[PDB]
Amino acid sequence: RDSEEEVLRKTAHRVDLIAKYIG
Amino acid sequence: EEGRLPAFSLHEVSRVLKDFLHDACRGFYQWLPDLSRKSEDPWRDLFLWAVLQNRYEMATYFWAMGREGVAAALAACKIIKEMSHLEKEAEVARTMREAKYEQLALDLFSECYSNSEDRAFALLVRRNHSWSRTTCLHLATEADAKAFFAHDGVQAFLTKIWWGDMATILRLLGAFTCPALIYTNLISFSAAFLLTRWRKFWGAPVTVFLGNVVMYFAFLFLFSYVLLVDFRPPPQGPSGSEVTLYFWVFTLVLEEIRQGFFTDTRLVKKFTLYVEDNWNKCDMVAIFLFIVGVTCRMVPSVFEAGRTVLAIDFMVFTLRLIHIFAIHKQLGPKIIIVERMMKDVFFFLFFLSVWLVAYGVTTQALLHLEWIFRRVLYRPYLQIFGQIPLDEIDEARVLYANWLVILLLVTFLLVTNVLLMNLLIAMFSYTFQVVQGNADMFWKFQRYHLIVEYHGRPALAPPFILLSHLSLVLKQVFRPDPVDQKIITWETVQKENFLSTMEKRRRDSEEEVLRKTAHRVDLIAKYIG
Amino acid sequence: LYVEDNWNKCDMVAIFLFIVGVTCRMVPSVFEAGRTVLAIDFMVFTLRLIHIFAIHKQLGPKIIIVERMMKDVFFFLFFLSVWLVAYGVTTQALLHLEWIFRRVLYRPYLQIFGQIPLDEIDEARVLYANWLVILLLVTFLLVTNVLLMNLLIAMFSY
Amino acid sequence: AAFLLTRWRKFWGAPVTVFLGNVVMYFAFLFLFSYVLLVDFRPPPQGPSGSEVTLYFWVFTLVLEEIRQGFFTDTRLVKKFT
Ligand SMILES: [Ca+2]
Ligand SMILES: [Ca+2]
User: How many CB pairs (< 8 A) connect B and C?
Assistant: First the structure.
């Protein structure tokens, strides 16, 4: 679960979501 | 309960304590004192508790708000090792063995020594009332964790001892040749002026050490000469040079007894520390061989056999003299690795001997118990030469054995030369790579020991060494705090800075950045929707 | 700057040896000794000529490394000489200063060959020394051959 | 009294124990056979066969021991021999 690459992927998803929802 | 002859109390606690760290904690808690009374060294007992209790972080924080650190930590690692073989639970045993406190202490010393190198050395030498007015050096000794010596400052203080008060090569050797204090007035230094300067030029460890190698070398040569032609029949003249050598040998024996007997709590412990050294064991067996051969003059009928005994003892002492060359910077680790591989090659050569025996047996009787036995033995001996005198076999063929002799010969050469050799370079590389630092430790270690011994060796020559021991026996029969605290505070501040630094480093850890960023971004995502 | 170069130092000592031997023709009584001096100088110049081969691309670093290890092997061979002296001393007198000395020296020389002429020892046994001779011989071969050699490959890799 | 019998069973049942015993026995028989090949490999007088037969009979016993160790460890005799 705590795999660093998994962290990268989850963070990428969350940031793309934040960017899209912001505009 | 054994002392009886919960139940335990501070009495048995102090008992067990003084049992482990013998000289460090002789007499704490002077059979019980007023339990209501407050402490003297509270944090001391705290860290002790946590150690006994195996509370790593606890003892950590205790050490934090404590004084006289490095020594404390040394004792800590010592007792951690103590409570390793005395553990029942295997996993708990490994956990206990996972102390790593030596690393902490080394960090402390590296830190403090990164400044005020002189004051740092002083700290390394300062007495320790907290640990019963003792020497951190001795602490590490009782700890026997060689890495304690691994720090550069260790070699620094050792060297500052080693090159004498005139610390400042072949120039120093030529100086050692002739007493030219004026040359010393040009080489290096650091009416009574000449007397004190001579004391300065003689008190150096390397000085007396070169003197000792000179004396030992000369006595080896002289004894070799005596064994050459002075090992004569029991006429008195023959005994003349013989007795001259033997009396001085006994003097050397007395010097060894002095160096090994008056360095101690228990005479048993003293003799144990003595028998610890392998080289002292070599000395003891050498004198055993010499005293055994000393029966030669007693029995002129057995004079030649006793002479052979003395020859063996000669070989012993000759091998012993070789011990010194390891003192060299570059040669040191070489001799160390050499000592390391001593065990395996023995068994390897045993196997080689078995194989050679097999070969010679298979060859001799199949070819053709004194006359026919001596020839067979000679053939076996000539195996190393490789003469291979199969002329007789060829004559016999002129047959069914020459082919098998060649086959077995070839395969024997193959197996021995290839394996018994190339196998050794593997262990050579293994002893090289990391066991080179290990043997650097070993070398620095024996180096410490030799430095102490030379310092421990009286500033005297072998001739008057008898006079020095006589003076010692006659003397026997005839019968600061502000600076300390200042340097203590220095160490405390050093520790504080070190810890702050370590945690500052831990803060900016990239993985910590990942975690904090992940938390912040999940928070932003959740709060956004 | 001149005396800086080691090879210029070799040149200087070579000419020193040549000029020293130049006294041979001056003293025909000492003509042969001066000739031996010239022979030494010859050896010097011969070694000197070898300096050039390092100029090669591939051979260069080889000769360089060779020059590097020059110091340690000297002391190693000194230790080996000490050990050989010990062995020969322990053997000769225990077995049996000119006639008996020359033979002992020859035995020491034959050590490299490994002839191991223990015939006299065997005759004596026909004894308490052959076993110790074999033990010390074996351990000497072991220590020298193994250590004094494999120690060098470490410095070679370094 | 049976204490010593059981303790002897304990000191003898160990693998390393019998193993050292075996190396001892094999070593000794190697030495003895080497001796027999040295001088007991004699003409066909009976005495010569004496030590010779003493060695050879025990060799056959060793053979039987090997057969035992390799034959009674099996589903198929073919699989056993394999
Ligand atoms: Ca000693
Ligand atoms: Ca030149």
Answer: 71
